[model samples]
Target: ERPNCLSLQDSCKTNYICRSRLADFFTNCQPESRSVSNCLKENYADCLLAYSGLIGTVMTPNVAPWCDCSNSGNDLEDCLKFLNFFKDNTCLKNAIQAFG
Candidate 1:
């Protein structure tokens, strides 16, 4: 069955938290020269495995045609920015609120 409004809200909240945690883990990893590309690859691989059967989106295909965010400093922010650009701006804003 399609997710109802409440269900979608719940799913969005879950997805948002997962996104935050994933970003934290990702940014803290060592940026050893080629580590950035390697890390993203490994993280995505791990996400696929880690979130198997999970309701949230652990990773998105936002980095296609590229593979490094180290140059962007806060890679997590950059990654999320890329994804946010493609997501519903209005819904994302509401879902991101910390229960405000």
Candidate 2:
């Protein structure tokens, strides 16, 4: 998402349009060539990471019992969910670092 049109720290919703004021910016932040279902499948946080590699910023609203990031045992999937919780871009590493 743009810093002004949205925000450097904004978390776009699933169906929110992201046009001049009504278009939709993918949460995973994929290219126009990408499809929503495909992007979601690609992990939303990674999308954010691709845009801003700071990997410690960005934001999301998915929470367990509320939102499920543990959809798969894959490393990226787990981290995407963690990022959604703590607003930390480093969630991927953090999850692994704290993996038990």
Candidate 3:
């Protein structure tokens, strides 16, 4: 069965490999305020590559792990947090938007 975002988040947090990949994603995709391009790496290719690294794993974003907050029970807050990390992240947003 497919898991939810909360479950994905828990797995990512607990697993060293996923955690390190997430760190790499954040590092390579970090946003820069002063740059003409918002991406810290100045290269969308690298940032996008980092983003793709999570694609085949449980931590993949905007795909799979379909979930709804209404049934999250006590985990609603954490569920939103997990969703926002991908949906609202400035660096990740900038990286993807740079290609278009």
Candidate 4:
């Protein structure tokens, strides 16, 4: 079941917060990296684990701002551009389960 429209406002806030947090997690996992590619290449397992655990902790729908917000045009991109870099990673895809 979904929350009412009023509740969604706050929920979406949490979702966006979670998105930024996850991006921060990535950067923290690989601070010296220039981009998502470098971070993944240098710390793939660490990134996957951190993201997986992040979503597991932050409760949100399996929908917008939760699974992906690139559709929102630069919402998540500002925090961590180039999620396209991880589109092929099975581990990253599976991490969505943690959000639910």
Candidate closest to the true structure, highest lDDT: 3
For model 1, name the residue pairs that clash.
none
Candidate with more favorable, higher TM-score: 1 or 2:
1
Better of 3 and 4 by TM-score: 3
TM-score of every candidate? 0.22, 0.19, 0.61, 0.33
Candidate 4, 1-100: lDDT as tens digits: 4333223334534676655655655454443334332333435555556654445433332422233432344355532333343343333444433332
* Candidate 1: segments with Cα more than 4 A from true spot: 1-11, 14-35, 40-45, 51-100
Clashes of each: 0, 12, 0, 0
RMSD of each: 14.6, 13.1, 4.1, 7.7
lDDT score, candidate 2: 0.32
Off by over 4 Å in 4: 1-24, 28-36, 40-42, 57-100
Error of 3 at 50 (Å): 2.0
lDDT of 1 by residue, 1-100 (tens): 3222223323444766755644543343323244232223334434333223223453322322123333444455754454342242232223223222
Q: All models: lDDT?
A: 0.35, 0.32, 0.67, 0.42
lDDT of 3 by residue, 7-97 (tens): 6667786988788777777677665654433566466777778778886667776532344445677888887866765666566666677
Runs of candidate 2 with Cα error greater than 4 angstroms are: 1-65, 75-86, 89-100
Ordering by lDDT: 3, 4, 1, 2
**Candidate 3 residue-wise lDDT at 2:** 53
Q: What TM-score number comes out for model 3?
A: 0.61
Q: Which of candidates 3 and 4 reaches a greater lDDT?
A: 3
Best by TM-score: 3
